Amino acid sequence: EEEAVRLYIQWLKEGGPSSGRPPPS
């Protein structure tokens, strides 16, 4: 039940590490 992974979702929803950004947490 984490929030940081909620960012990770956000991150992944943006494409994840293929977006040009490394995963959040």
Domain limits for position 22: 1-25
The DSSP secondary-structure symbol of 3 reads S
The DSSP secondary-structure symbol of 21 reads S
Count of domains in the chain? Answer: 1
In whole angstroms, how far apart are CA 7 and each of 2, 23? 9, 9
In whole angstroms, how far apart are CA 6 and each of 16, 18? 12, 18
Structure tokens given for 1 = 């039940």
| Residues 7 and 22: beta-carbon distance below 8 Å | no
| Residues 4 and 24: beta-carbon distance below 8 Å | yes
Technique used by the depositors? NMR
Residue type, position 1, single letter: E
Structure tokens given for 2 = 């984490």
| Residues 6 and 13: beta-carbon distance below 8 Å | no
| Residues 7 and 20: beta-carbon distance below 8 Å | no
